[PDB]
């Protein structure tokens, strides 16, 4: 009652990751981003993985 | 009175009315940001007392259009993102605009 | 002598595949390998430029969370598989459009891309997207430009009409770098080594232009600590 006229808007939003956000597996260890390192930074073994 | 949806909103340029239509409503698809106007609303308003050092400017510079308030639709601070959808509900009654 | 070392010097390249390659660096002395072998595996996986796509234009799409008839993806997919189009664009050009039309039932795959011989597609088999129907019809315009890192969409500077749609770029064609040092039979020490440099890559960039880049930026940044002075 009283209400002439309804707009709705869906705005859809992309979340990427970024610290601060939670992380977490399936036996309880759940943890927050600290950093993102870039690839030359991180460990690699002897095939250059990281 | 009856609040309009409309794309006349007083003190707001064209560069803000970019994405909205002929009846005041975004585009589907558009990529809008923090602060965009979404879908365009007036609100009829009453009196309002103005202080004697606002009628000065008032005689100086003679603009004075307050016949309605902005009450808009308004994208959330923080909140980026593309309109995927909009849907309009009319009253039974009520003309239903070009959106 | 002990004052001067030997240089070394760019002796084989080895093209396992059109992503796979091998470098070998001959003669360096003692420690030398481990010290190049960082510093340019460092240099390649981070600062190597290239060609990536930016933006695209499919017909009757205005956003990327929408379905077109006759295509088993939606955009959003489609923008994914174009994310992994390998593309070599002409020196002197950072920007070009290719267009993509194709109709009729079957998978659309990069090698049906129309190019104005500029533009080198390394991977024609890589698959686009799908059309479920024979009177399907695709057509878009797709934008590559080159750059160096990775730039998101939503860091590009800020009009833009709807229906173009931003593709988040990762201009760097390195994917892996791996180094080993091993022995040297040069003349008759045995001090000297030899670095193998393992690149796998998208095969846009060549492995020997790959390693000058690298050279070059590296001795760039020490040309500072050459002339070290109060600035």
Redesign the interface.
């Known amino acids: 009652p009283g209400v002439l006229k309804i707009v709705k808007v869906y705005l859809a939003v992309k979340r990427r990751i970024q610290p601060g956000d939670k992380m977490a597996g399936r036996h309880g260890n759940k943890g927050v981003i600290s950093k993102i390192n870039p690839v030359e930074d991180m460990p690699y073994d002897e095939n250059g993985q990281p | 009175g009856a609040e309009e949806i409309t794309a006349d909103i007083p003190n707001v340029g064209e560069a803000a009315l970019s994405k909205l239509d002929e009846s005041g409503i975004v585009y589907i698809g558009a990529e809008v940001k923090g602060g965009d106007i979404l879908v365009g609303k007036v609100t009829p308003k009453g009196e309002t007392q103005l202080t004697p050092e606002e009628k000065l400017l008032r005689a100086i510079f003679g603009e004075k259009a307050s016949d309605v308030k902005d009450t808009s639709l308004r994208v959330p601070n923080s909140v980026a993102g593309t309109v995927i959808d909009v849907q309009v509900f009319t009253r039974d009654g009520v003309e239903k605009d070009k959106r | 002598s002990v004052t001067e070392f030997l240089k070394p010097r760019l002796v084989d390249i080895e093209q396992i595949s059109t992503t796979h390659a091998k470098v070998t660096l001959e003669p360096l002395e003692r420690g030398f390998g481990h010290t190049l072998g960082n510093a340019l595996?460092?240099i390649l996986?981070?600062s190597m430029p290239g060609c990536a796509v930016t933006e695209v234009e499919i017909e009757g799409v205005?956003?990327?969370?929408?379905t077109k008839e006759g295509v088993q993806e939606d955009i959003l997919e489609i923008l994914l598989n174009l994310k992994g189009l390998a593309v070599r664009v002409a020196e002197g050009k950072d920007e070009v459009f290719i267009t993509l039309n194709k109709s009729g039932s079957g998978p659309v795959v990069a090698g049906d891309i129309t190019h104005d011989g500029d533009v080198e597609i390394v991977n024609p088999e890589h698959v686009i997207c799908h059309l479920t129907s024979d009177n399907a019809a695709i057509a878009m315009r797709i934008k590559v430009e080159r750059g160096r890192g990775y730039v998101?969409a939503?860091a590009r500077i800020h009009?833009?009409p709807?229906?173009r749609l931003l593709v988040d770029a990762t201009f760097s064609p390195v994917d892996?770098?791996?180094?080993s040092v091993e022995a040297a039979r040069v003349e008759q020490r045995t001090d000297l080594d030899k670095l193998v440099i393992?690149m796998?890559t998208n095969g846009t960039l060549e492995p020997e232009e790959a390693i000058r880049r690298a050279a070059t930026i590296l001795a760039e940044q020490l040309d500072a600590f050459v002339d070290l002075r109060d600035v």
């Open positions: 595996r460092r996986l981070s205005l956003h990327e969370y929408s998101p939503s009009e833009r709807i229906g892996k770098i791996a180094y393992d796998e």
